[PDB]
Design a protein around this ligand. Structure first.
Ligand SMILES: */C(=C/C(=O)OCC)[C@H](C[C@@H]1CCNC1=O)NC(=O)[C@H](Cc1ccccc1)NC(C)=O
Length: 181
């Protein structure tokens, strides 16, 4: 097997989890230790269902920028025996665009699902459900309900979390390493 599939499959096995909140099914990325990230609108409460188990959330932090604006990312600290494989070195120091990217989804409804969203480009401000969110990126792929939380990836780098869409173009919250320091 080749390198790009190896990485995505490995990411799946060790870092990308099937979850459900009161808002339904999402894909969750475990970044390191007990720290994972979910899209903000998933609204994790005190517990979250992670694959086969309800897990207690010790702390949740919804990220905003310096101009108070939403970023559509919640950092969660889990009460779990598991440390996540630390993949913060695969996350760029600053939000980065990419080419021939792949969106990696993992929910009970869409398990181990690979979506070739193609080139990923800067995008900026986005309106999702009359909520405005900064630091955003775009792929011209018609993304779908249930794909939120899905992991935007290319060339062994981890660059975004799917948050939103319109029938023609899908959009992610860009990742940067400082969020997980
Ligand atoms: C992912 C969440 C989901 O399945 O929720 C069920 C409603 C979707 C995926 C996107 C949108 C539709 N097609 C796609 O590929 N995202 C959203 O529903 C997203 C939710 C949201 C709310 C508030 C702030 C940011 C994002 N909203 C939109 C309009 O996409």
């Amino acid at each position: 097997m080749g390198p790009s599939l190896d990485f995505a499959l490995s990411l799946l096995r060790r870092n990308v989890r099937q979850v459900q909140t009161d808002q339904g099914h999402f894909t969750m990325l475990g970044v390191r230790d007990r720290l994972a990230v979910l899209p903000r609108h998933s609204q994790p409460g005190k517990t979250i269902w992670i694959e086969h188990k309800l897990v207690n959330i010790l702390d949740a932090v919804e990220l905003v920028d310096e101009q108070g604006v939403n970023l559509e990312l919640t950092l969660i600290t889990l009460d779990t025996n598991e440390k996540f494989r630390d993949i913060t070195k695969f996350i760029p120091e600053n939000i980065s665009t990419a080419s021939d990217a792949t969106l990696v989804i993992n929910t009970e409804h869409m398990p181990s699902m690979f979506v070739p969203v193609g080139d990923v480009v800067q995008y900026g401000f986005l309106n999702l459900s009359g909520k405005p969110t900064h630091r955003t990126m775009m792929y011209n792929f018609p993304t779908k309900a249930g794909q939120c939380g899905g992991v935007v990836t290319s060339v062994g780098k981890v660059i975004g979390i799917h948050i939103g869409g319109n029938g023609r173009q899908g959009f992610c919250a860009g990742l940067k390493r400082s969020y997980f320091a």
